[PDB]
Design a protein around this ligand. Structure first.
Ligand SMILES: [Mg+2]
Length: 264
């Protein structure tokens, strides 16, 4: 309870009464929110934390037997919100944290007033009638490259994920990937890149705001309309006509403006 608040570097900041949870995605820690955070401090009580796989978390907390699916990540998120006495919040999740939020809302339909999903995909692998963006052989090459030379893999991947030519964003993202223990990054990548959340989307009943860029290395644009059509509540797509997977790093003014609109 307090042990987990300390383990996952939980931070609560801001002068507002309405609770806003900012949950980082794959390859980052809560520092990925630094550029947009100031724009939410007056109107919100902002909760930030690190996923157990973040480089900022002691690797002794990464229980390989436990963290084989997204369900225990959901257990950690809900244990934090319960320990903080949060009855209701708005939740923002980037990439894997979008899927953790979805599963959390199915378990606790009353806890979230809305989900904001950034760079979200329920499935990366192509299927008969479904474009996720990747064939199994392409995902296997990522795992093989990661294992063979982690530094070379990070240096090649970070600029593709950022997409746009924003060197400060490439450096920021590379730093958090390099902070991660390589066996943990590979394990988490197998969890995420092989995931399939499609079957549970219709169980969500809270409103979802789906933020999608026009050119995201990891998320075809058609996944955003798939999410709009398959999540079970009232859904809004926020099109960002820019390039990249990490708009909170590469387009923070535009992202903060869109997040303010989604939260109103
Ligand atoms: Mg280009």
């Amino acid at each position: 309870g307090q042990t987990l608040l300390d383990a996952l570097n939980v931070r609560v900041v801001g002068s507002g009464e309405r609770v806003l949870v900012l949950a980082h995605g794959f390859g980052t820690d809560q520092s990925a929110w630094n550029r947009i955070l100031p724009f939410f401090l007056r109107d919100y009580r902002v909760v930030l934390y690190d996923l157990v796989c973040a480089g900022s978390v002691n690797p002794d907390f990464f229980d390989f037997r436990r963290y084989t699916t997204l369900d225990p990540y959901v257990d950690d998120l809900l244990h934090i919100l319960d320990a903080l006495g949060i009855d209701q919040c708005a939740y923002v999740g980037h990439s894997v944290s979008a899927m953790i939020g979805i599963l959390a809302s199915i378990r606790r339909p009353e806890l979230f007033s809305k989900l904001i999903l950034i760079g979200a995909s329920p499935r990366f692998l192509n299927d008969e009638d479904y474009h996720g963006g990747f064939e199994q052989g392409e995902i296997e090459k990522v795992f093989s490259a990661m294992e063979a030379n982690y530094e070379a893999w990070v240096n090649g991947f970070a600029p593709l994920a950022v997409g746009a030519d924003v060197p400060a964003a490439v450096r920021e993202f590379s730093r958090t990937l390099f902070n991660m223990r390589p066996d943990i990054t590979l394990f988490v990548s197998r969890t995420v890149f092989n995931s399939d959340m499609r079957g549970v989307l219709g169980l969500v009943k809270v409103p979802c705001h789906i933020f999608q860029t026009a050119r995201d290395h990891s998320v075809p644009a058609s996944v955003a309309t798939y999410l709009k059509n398959h999540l079970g509540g009232k859904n809004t797509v926020h099109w960002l006509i820019i390039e990249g997977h990490l708009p909170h790093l590469s387009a923070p003014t535009l992202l903060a403006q869109e997040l303010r609109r989604a939260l109103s």
